[PDB]
Structure formats: structure tokens, C-alpha cells
């Protein structure tokens, strides 16, 4: 239990090497994204780049806690998968929503026309991740949401594990600590791997996989790693394309099947469509609706896209809906113990609580990828004076821990706190469940009193965990 | 041989699509330097990276030369080596030069030190690299320099194999064009492999690697890659110091044993001290003694350093003299085969000659590394004043057959018409009279705009390719 160096009490020499020693590797490995001062760095690969903003060495997490969220990794992804077929449970959950909020309308639009249209689908599949922070109070590892959508950092979240496991290889004996418990993580390959058995049991080998990326991603690097290893180990075809792009050369051939500027598709992977802002015109919806109706297997689904959002994160959380969806006893008891306290804006006792006591809660609206979510005075504000477009949640605390924080060559100290990102791949084919499991992770770590922790936007950093 | 596609005439389309693949690539795989206008990124990795300058699809060498350098390697490494045993001739070729420049004479100094030292090393290495161009006229493998001394590129000139394999597997089927004729390469496995079995020669195994580098390095990851492969592959440990920091941190152990910041050194790598730029003070020149005078195996040492002069390329070009260093009659033949016109600026036949024609003439002083000769206009201008002249060499000037190339650089791609310089790493490692390693060890290629006198990558002038064999 001796807690783990303190890594402010490091000698200015030897840390000064660490960081140096991190550089290095996070430039031969590519652990890189476009720099956000470079204008064209999120468009023109190989230019303007730099290392992602990280820790230097991993925070404590007990191996029990760690242990915890593998074992809900495939309860999850079965989760996800059952809720996603009751298409009543999602419109109604989400029919006051959908007057508040015009973005979660349109996912909702797509959705009734596929329930209008009711196509014998058996293939589909998930590349999700769960993410949890130990709550120090009550000691327990509760999750903050679930990503059906768009997952980030299976190979950013891989190669943090390969730069720590390195760290401590060379700089362990004088710091009390073994790279061995930094736990191994092959989530980039995982995630790969989803995708090339999805696309076999589509089995067309002729066929490609359609990947949906945003107009600027600086990350893009870690979608062509993706793409590299489905050509070069699994010899399967990717293509490229924006919302807009397929919307252009995308078509339904008379057979179903999606053809895009001429390539027939079979997989369609979204790096994108997960925001209102990948949906200028009327253009990108047009090609969202265009590749939900083709027989391509979607990872995800708008069904997955909606299971995803916070208020169904909520509902689940309500009494006895969690067991319309699961039957085994057991999972119901792991997964109602990771639930935090979530409510909706119509419990008006728990929105008297938060008004009063706005620093105990989280406000967030139906958003992903951060920005979104409001805190403490915002919140008080913005629940005095649309109500459909929130839940409040339980304020998680962790135990903080010391951090070197190295973005953009330079490194500071700081109390941080992570969140702990524990993917999980789908697949399945009739009753037949091909892949189900935990692949690997992430985590994301932030100043413990900063309210924002995108890594992206310049508010957090990478991580690994070290287990206790 | 059936012309290649000319690369510029590829669709738009086709093309932007190549490019892209090949910066993603590049990023992917740290085909990387610093960028030169971001400040700290010759010194702070991690920041302000940019992909090498490159050509995007190999231009044509014929197979026939192509063996010839691949020959030519274990040969040149032999003949490096039997130079370098000739302290002699080294002095005396040198003696000249050394009154016309301070650096060679600096260098000089430390190599007299050593033959009064006298002490036997049986263990000697080398990594080197051979640079041939092809001259139109005449279809001749002609070797422009002899690299004895911080060769780069064999991370690189990997890498550029991978990319264009990689771009050609894609794209090759479009262009008439198979990977197959991009030859295979091992240069920077081979660079590591060489260092690896040079200390475990030297048999310490507590002992590490030092690095010698240059104060701004924006090609330092081809550096980090090589330390680790040692670490990783090799478990053998770098420490990385500037001369400056060697003559801080170093001192020679009552054992002979060079020691640097507290930790042994069996081997020396140098990728500094082969320019005038890296000695600021009296500090660089006594970390520079101090290193040859310790046990350590150096690659190189300070006789291989200076058989990599332009002056003993040039002498050894002499008739007769190449006959002293080699025994092997076959040998001899392909080492003169590859020899260009060289003369020593006291030969004035070929000073009026050259005065009358300069463009078809480069003159060198006695550095390496980029951006020192001098050709057509400034060599008839540098060459009357000149009426010390043991500073330069004559040589030559190739006329390699141009190919149409993509140039990459900086996110952008240009059409230009080229000419490339093939660069053929060895590997030599002897023990006494048991010779390890002597081997052909991969490549690399520069490429640049025919008509530029430049061809330096990181300075703006060249970029890196490979070739396709034809
Ligand atoms: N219940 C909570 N307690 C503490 N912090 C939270 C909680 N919910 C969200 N956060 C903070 O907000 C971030 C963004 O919230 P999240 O629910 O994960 O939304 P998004 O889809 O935008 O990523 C989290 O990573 C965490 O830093
Ligand atoms: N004999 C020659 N004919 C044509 N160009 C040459 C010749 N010698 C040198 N050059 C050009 O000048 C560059 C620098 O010359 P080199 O002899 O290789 O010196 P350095 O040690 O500085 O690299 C070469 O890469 C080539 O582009
Ligand atoms: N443009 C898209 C970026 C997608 C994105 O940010 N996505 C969310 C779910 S949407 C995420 O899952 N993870 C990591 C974010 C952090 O911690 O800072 C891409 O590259 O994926
Ligand atoms: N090539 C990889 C390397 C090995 C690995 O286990 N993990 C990789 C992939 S996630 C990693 O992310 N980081 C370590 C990066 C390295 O040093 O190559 C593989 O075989 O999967
Ligand atoms: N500090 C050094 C740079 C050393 C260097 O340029 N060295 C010479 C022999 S000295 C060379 O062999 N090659 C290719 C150079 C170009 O075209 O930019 C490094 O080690 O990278
Ligand atoms: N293979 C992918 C692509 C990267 C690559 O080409 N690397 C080169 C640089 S040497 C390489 O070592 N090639 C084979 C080595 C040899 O033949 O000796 C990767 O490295 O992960
Ligand atoms: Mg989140
Ligand atoms: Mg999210
Ligand atoms: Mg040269
Ligand atoms: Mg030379
Ligand atoms: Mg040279």
C-alpha cells in the first residue's frame, strides 16, 4: 500500500532524461497527431507534427478495480448490442429529447426509417469503450459514460502502454516501480481485428471497408495505423471519405449494396458523424441515411449510435430497466455497481439538490467528444433559466496523484486525475457470437480541478495506470 | 531498357493520391527530422517534425551497375583499411594541406600523437559509404566520395525502400511497375549489427556505447533508431554527448579504460567531428584526443578518418599508388574502373584546362557533410587567384542521364528532371588478423534538380529516393 514515488521529489537530472527519453520515443513510434498551431496539420499528413500531450509515468489503480472493468467489458458490449433492438425503448426514452434537441432529432429520424423499413440484418457488430474513474470516497469504480460511436486512442491508448512499459524498463530500479504492472494492451490490433472478421462475414473479398473521417483530424494518424494494419496483415481494402465525399460518389447499387466512387463497401467504420458539426448540410445527412439503408455492416449502427447518447446512459440507470435487458443475475448485480447517480431534469428534488449544491454534479447535454458538459456555477445558471437536452449526474472525486505533464516538449508538475477507457469488440453473426471481448485500453488523465480533460483540445493528456 | 512511366504524366488525381499515401507513410514510420524553421527542433525531439524531402517513385540504374557498387563494398572496406595502416603516406599525401588548412592539420596532430603512442589495436571497424553516380557518356559507375566518418542515412535510406515498396505494391500495377526492382535492404540493421559485434569484440560487457553527436541535430532520429536497436535487440546501452560534454564529463582510467560521466566505453560511434563547425574551442579538439588515445574501439578511428579526405581519394588515384594497398589483380581493376578523373591543383595541364572549362569540373576542399565545393563561374574565379591551393582537389564533373521525378517537400510536390547519387553502405570489423565483418550493407540514395551544384537533403537542396533496377 507505500504509495508510488513521488514524481515531484524526482532529481532534475534524471527526469530531465526521462522526458528527453520520452520524446525520442514518441517520435520513432508515432506517437504523434498534428500540431494545432500548424494550419494545414489536421489535412496534409507528415507536416506540422508533434507527440501527444502525456504523462510522463503512470498514476496507482488497484489491480481489483482494473480487474473490475475488464469483467464488465463483454457485459457491456451485450448490453449494448440487446438494448439496441428494442427500437421502442430508444424512441421513447428519447421523445423529449428530440424536441430539445435537433442534432439527437435527426439520429432519430434515421432510426424510425429503418424501423419503417425492418431489413433481416444478422450481422452487426461493436468497437466500443466503457470508461470509469475510482470514485475515493466510496472506493469504487463507477463508470463516467459509454462509447458507442467513434471510439478514440486504441493505438494512442496502445503505444502510451509500450512508452511507460520503456520508462520504467530503463528508469524502474531507481523508482520503486516494474513495467510488468503496467497492464499489457494490444487495442489497436483489436479493433483491426473486429473490422477484418466483420468483413469476412460479410465475405465478399472484393469488397472494401468505408472509413467516415472529419474534414480536420489531427488524429488521423492513429485511423491510418487502423487502415495499415487491415491492408498489410489482413489484406483488406480502406477507403477515405468525409460525410460530404459519400454524399457525392456514394449510391446504393440495385443489389443493396453501397458503392462509393465506384468501390463496393461492405464495412463502413465512422471516425466522424458523432457531432452536429460533421453535418453542415443536408448533404451529410443524405449520406449517413444513404449507408444506414445498405446491406454494408456499420460499425456502429444508429441503434449502437443511440444507446450511446447520456440519456439512455440515464434510463438505464432507472429501476428495473436494466434487467428488461439482461438475465443474468450476476452481470446485473457488477453492472448496476459500476452506476453512478444519474437523473433526469424531471426529478425535481435531485435539480433542488443541484441548484444548492451545483459542485456535487455534472450537466450534460447529448454530445460526444468533449467541450459539452457544465459544472458547478454554469450549472446553477443554466438550471435557474430545452430540458430534454440534459441529464445530471453524480460528481465522481478521485484520489488525485502527482504528474509530470509533458505537452509540447516542455513538462510541468501537477495533481491529476485519470479515467481509466476499457474498449470492448462486438461481432456477432446470427445467434452466432463471434467476438465479444475486452480489447485493451486508454486513459486519460487531467488537472483534478480542471473541468474539461479533451485531450485534443489541450486539456488533458495520456496515460497508462499502474497497478496496485 | 523499356523507359519507365514518366512520372509526370500521371493523372491529377492518381498522383495527389500517391503523395498522400506517401506522407502518411512517412509520418507512420518516422521517416521524420526536425523542421528547420521551428527553432528547437534540431534539440528538443518530439516537436516541430516534418517528413524527409523525398522523391516519390524511384528513377531507373541498371542492374549491371547496381552490382558493380554492391562489388565494389567489401572491397572498398579492405582498401579503407589497409590505408589506414600506412601512417606514412597518410602524413605525406596530408603535408601539403596541412599548411593550407587548420582542420586537416588539427586532425593531422592527433593522428602524429597516436604513431608516437604506437600502442597495437587489433580491433578495427569501419561503418562507411561509397557514393556513385552513373556518367551518360560512357555508361560508368563512377564514385563521387569515399564516406569514412558519421555516414548518414541508413535509417533513412531504409525507410525510403519501405516507402516505395509500399507505394509501388499499391500503385505499381497502374505505372507498369513491380517493388521486386527496388532492391532489398538491411542498412540500418546492418549499422547496429556492426556496432553490436564491435563491443562484444572488445568484451566488456558492462561497458556502453558512446554516441558522439552534434550539438543541433534535426536528424537525430535516425541516432535514437540505432540506440535503439542496441538497447532493444543488442541489449547494449548508448549514452549521447556533444565533444563539448566529452571533454566535461570524460577522463581515461588508470586501465587505459575511457570513462564518460561515470560509465565505461568499450566502442565510439561518431556522428560529429567531421567538420571544422563541431571544434568551437580547445574542448572539442581534447575530447577528440582524449577519446583516440583510450582503449575504446572508434568507428572511425582518427587514420580512417583521414583516408576519407578528398586529398587521399585523389592520391590514391595516382598510377601506381592504389597498387601499394591492394594485392588482388581483379580488385584493382574494379577499383580503377570506378575512379574518375582526380588531380592534385599542382598538376596545371589540368589547371589551364580547367580554367578554360570550368562546368566540366568540381573542385573540393577537405570537408565533408554539405555545401563546400565549388563548380563552373566560382571555380575559374577561385582557381586565378589561386597564382595553399593544397586546400582543394580537382575532379571531374559526371553527367548522370536526368529522369523525371515528383520532389516532396514540406507537405508539397513539384515536377522536376534529376540526377541521383547512390550511396553503398559497408560493414568491416577485424580482430588481429580474423576478419569479422566485411560486408555490403544496404543503401541509400540522394537525388536532386540536375543542373543544382547542392544536393545536400537537410540544407534545402537534395531529397532522399531510392532506385528501380532496370
Ligand atoms: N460524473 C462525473 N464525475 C466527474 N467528472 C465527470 C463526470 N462526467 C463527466 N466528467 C468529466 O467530463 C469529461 C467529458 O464527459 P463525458 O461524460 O465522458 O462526455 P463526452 O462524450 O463528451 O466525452 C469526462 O472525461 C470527465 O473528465
Ligand atoms: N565529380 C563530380 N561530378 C558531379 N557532381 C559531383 C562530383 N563531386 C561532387 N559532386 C556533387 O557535389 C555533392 C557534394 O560532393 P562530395 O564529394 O560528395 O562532398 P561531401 O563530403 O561534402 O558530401 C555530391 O553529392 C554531388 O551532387
Ligand atoms: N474525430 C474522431 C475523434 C472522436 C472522439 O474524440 N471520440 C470519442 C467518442 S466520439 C472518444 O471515444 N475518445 C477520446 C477523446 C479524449 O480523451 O480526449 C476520432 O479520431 O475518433
Ligand atoms: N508493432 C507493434 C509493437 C508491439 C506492441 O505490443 N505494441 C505496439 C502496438 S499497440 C505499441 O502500440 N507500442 C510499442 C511500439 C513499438 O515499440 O513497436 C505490435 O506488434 O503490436
Ligand atoms: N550530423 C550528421 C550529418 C552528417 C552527414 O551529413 N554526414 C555525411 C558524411 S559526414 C553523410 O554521410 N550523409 C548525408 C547528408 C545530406 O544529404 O543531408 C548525421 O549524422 O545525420
Ligand atoms: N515494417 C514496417 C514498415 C517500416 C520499414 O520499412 N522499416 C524498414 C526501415 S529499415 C525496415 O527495417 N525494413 C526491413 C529491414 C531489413 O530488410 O533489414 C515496420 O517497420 O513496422
Ligand atoms: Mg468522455
Ligand atoms: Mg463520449
Ligand atoms: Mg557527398
Ligand atoms: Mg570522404
Ligand atoms: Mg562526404
Given at each position: 500500500?507505500?504509495?508510488?514515488?513521488?514524481?515531484?521529489?524526482?532529481?532534475?537530472?534524471?527526469?530531465?532524461?526521462?522526458?528527453?527519453?520520452?520524446?525520442?520515443?514518441?517520435?520513432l513510434n508515432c506517437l504523434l497527431v498534428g500540431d494545432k498551431s500548424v494550419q494545414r496539420s489536421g489535412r496534409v499528413p507528415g507536416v506540422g507534427l508533434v507527440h501527444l500531450p502525456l504523462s510522463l509515468l503512470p498514476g496507482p489503480f488497484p489491480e481489483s478495480h482494473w480487474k473490475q472493468g475488464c469483467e464488465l467489458a463483454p457485459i457491456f458490449n451485450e448490453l449494448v448490442d440487446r438494448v439496441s433492438l428494442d427500437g421502442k425503448f430508444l424512441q421513447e426514452s428519447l421523445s423529449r429529447t428530440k424536441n430539445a434537441d435537433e442534432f439527437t432529432s435527426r439520429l432519430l429520424d434515421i432510426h424510425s426509417k429503418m424501423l419503417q423499413i425492418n431489413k433481416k440484418e444478422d450481422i452487426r457488430m461493436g468497437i466500443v469503450r466503457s470508461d470509469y474513474m475510482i470514485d475515493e470516497k466510496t472506493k469504487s469504480l463507477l463508470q463516467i459514460e459509454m462509447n458507442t460511436i467513434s471510439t478514440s486512442?486504441?493505438?494512442?491508448?496502445?503505444?502510451?502502454?509500450?512508452?511507460?512499459?520503456?520508462?520504467?524498463?530503463?528508469?524502474?530500479?531507481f523508482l520503486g516501480l516494474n513495467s510488468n504492472r503496467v497492464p499489457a494492451n494490444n487495442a489497436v490490433d483489436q479493433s483491426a481485428e473486429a473490422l477484418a472478421k466483420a468483413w469476412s462475414e460479410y465475405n465478399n473479398p472484393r469488397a472494401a471497408i468505408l472509413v467516415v473521417v472529419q474534414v480536420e483530424e489531427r488524429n488521423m494518424y492513429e485511423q491510418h495505423y487502423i487502415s495499415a494494419l487491415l491492408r498489410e496483415k489482413?489484406?483488406?481494402?480502406?477507403?477515405?471519405?468525409?460525410?460530404?465525399?459519400?454524399?457525392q460518389e456514394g449510391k446504393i447499387l440495385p443489389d443493396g449494396t453501397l458503392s462509393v466512387d465506384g468501390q463496393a463497401i461492405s464495412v463502413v467504420y465512422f471516425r466522424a458523424g458523432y457531432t452536429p458539426?460533421?453535418?453542415?448540410?443536408?448533404?451529410?445527412?443524405?449520406?449517413?441515411?444513404?449507408?444506414?439503408?445498405?446491406?454494408?455492416?456499420?460499425?456502429?449502427?444508429?441503434?449502437?449510435?443511440?444507446?450511446?447518447?447520456?440519456?439512455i446512459q440515464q434510463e438505464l440507470a432507472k429501476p428495473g430497466v436494466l434487467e428488461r435487458f439482461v438475465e443474468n443475475k450476476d452481470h446485473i448485480a457488477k453492472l448496476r455497481a459500476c452506476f453512478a447517480g444519474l437523473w433526469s431534469l424531471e426529478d425535481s428534488d435531485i435539480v433542488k439538490k443541484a441548484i444548492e449544491n451545483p459542485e456535487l454534479f455534472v450537466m450534460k447535454p447529448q454530445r460526444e467528444g468533449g467541450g459539452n458538459n457544465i459544472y458547478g456555477d454554469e450549472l446553477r445558471e443554466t438550471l435557474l433559466k430545452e430540458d430534454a437536452a440534459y441529464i445530471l449526474m453524480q460528481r465522481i472525486f478521485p484520489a488525485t496523484s502527482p504528474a509530470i505533464l509533458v505537452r509540447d516538449g516542455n513538462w510541468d508538475t501537477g495533481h491529476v486525475i485519470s479515467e481509466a477507457g476499457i474498449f470492448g469488440t462486438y461481432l456477432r453473426n446470427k445467434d452466432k457470437i463471434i467476438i465479444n471481448n475486452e480489447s485493451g485500453y486508454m486513459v486519460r488523465t487531467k488537472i483534478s480541478s480542471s473541468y474539461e480533460g479533451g485531450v485534443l483540445p489541450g486539456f488533458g493528456v495520456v496515460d497508462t495506470v499502474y497497478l496496485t
Amino acid at each position: 500500500a507505500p504509495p508510488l514515488f513521488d514524481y515531484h521529489r524526482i532529481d532534475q537530472k534524471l527526469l530531465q532524461n526521462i522526458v528527453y527519453d520520452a520524446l525520442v520515443w514518441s517520435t520513432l513510434n508515432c506517437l504523434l497527431v498534428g500540431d494545432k498551431s500548424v494550419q494545414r496539420s489536421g489535412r496534409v499528413p507528415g507536416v506540422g507534427l508533434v507527440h501527444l500531450p502525456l504523462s510522463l509515468l503512470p498514476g496507482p489503480f488497484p489491480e481489483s478495480h482494473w480487474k473490475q472493468g475488464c469483467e464488465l467489458a463483454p457485459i457491456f458490449n451485450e448490453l449494448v448490442d440487446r438494448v439496441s433492438l428494442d427500437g421502442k425503448f430508444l424512441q421513447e426514452s428519447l421523445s423529449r429529447t428530440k424536441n430539445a434537441d435537433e442534432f439527437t432529432s435527426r439520429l432519430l429520424d434515421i432510426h424510425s426509417k429503418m424501423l419503417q423499413i425492418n431489413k433481416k440484418e444478422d450481422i452487426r457488430m461493436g468497437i466500443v469503450r466503457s470508461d470509469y474513474m475510482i470514485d475515493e470516497k466510496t472506493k469504487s469504480l463507477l463508470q463516467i459514460e459509454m462509447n458507442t460511436i467513434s471510439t478514440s486512442f486504441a493505438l494512442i491508448g496502445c503505444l502510451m502502454t509500450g512508452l511507460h512499459k520503456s520508462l520504467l524498463s530503463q528508469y524502474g530500479k531507481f523508482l520503486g516501480l516494474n513495467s510488468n504492472r503496467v497492464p499489457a494492451n494490444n487495442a489497436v490490433d483489436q479493433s483491426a481485428e473486429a473490422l477484418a472478421k466483420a468483413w469476412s462475414e460479410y465475405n465478399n473479398p472484393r469488397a472494401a471497408i468505408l472509413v467516415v473521417v472529419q474534414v480536420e483530424e489531427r488524429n488521423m494518424y492513429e485511423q491510418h495505423y487502423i487502415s495499415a494494419l487491415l491492408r498489410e496483415k489482413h489484406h483488406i481494402r480502406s477507403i477515405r471519405k468525409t460525410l460530404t465525399e459519400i454524399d457525392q460518389e456514394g449510391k446504393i447499387l440495385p443489389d443493396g449494396t453501397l458503392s462509393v466512387d465506384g468501390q463496393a463497401i461492405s464495412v463502413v467504420y465512422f471516425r466522424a458523424g458523432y457531432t452536429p458539426k460533421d453535418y453542415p448540410s443536408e448533404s451529410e445527412w443524405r449520406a449517413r441515411l444513404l449507408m444506414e439503408q445498405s446491406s454494408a455492416i456499420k460499425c456502429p449502427t444508429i441503434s449502437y449510435h443511440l444507446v450511446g447518447t447520456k440519456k439512455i446512459q440515464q434510463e438505464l440507470a432507472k429501476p428495473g430497466v436494466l434487467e428488461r435487458f439482461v438475465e443474468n443475475k450476476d452481470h446485473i448485480a457488477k453492472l448496476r455497481a459500476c452506476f453512478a447517480g444519474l437523473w433526469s431534469l424531471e426529478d425535481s428534488d435531485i435539480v433542488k439538490k443541484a441548484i444548492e449544491n451545483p459542485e456535487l454534479f455534472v450537466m450534460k447535454p447529448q454530445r460526444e467528444g468533449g467541450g459539452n458538459n457544465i459544472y458547478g456555477d454554469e450549472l446553477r445558471e443554466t438550471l435557474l433559466k430545452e430540458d430534454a437536452a440534459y441529464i445530471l449526474m453524480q460528481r465522481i472525486f478521485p484520489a488525485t496523484s502527482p504528474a509530470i505533464l509533458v505537452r509540447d516538449g516542455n513538462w510541468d508538475t501537477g495533481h491529476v486525475i485519470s479515467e481509466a477507457g476499457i474498449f470492448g469488440t462486438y461481432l456477432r453473426n446470427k445467434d452466432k457470437i463471434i467476438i465479444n471481448n475486452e480489447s485493451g485500453y486508454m486513459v486519460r488523465t487531467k488537472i483534478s480541478s480542471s473541468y474539461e480533460g479533451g485531450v485534443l483540445p489541450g486539456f488533458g493528456v495520456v496515460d497508462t495506470v499502474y497497478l496496485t
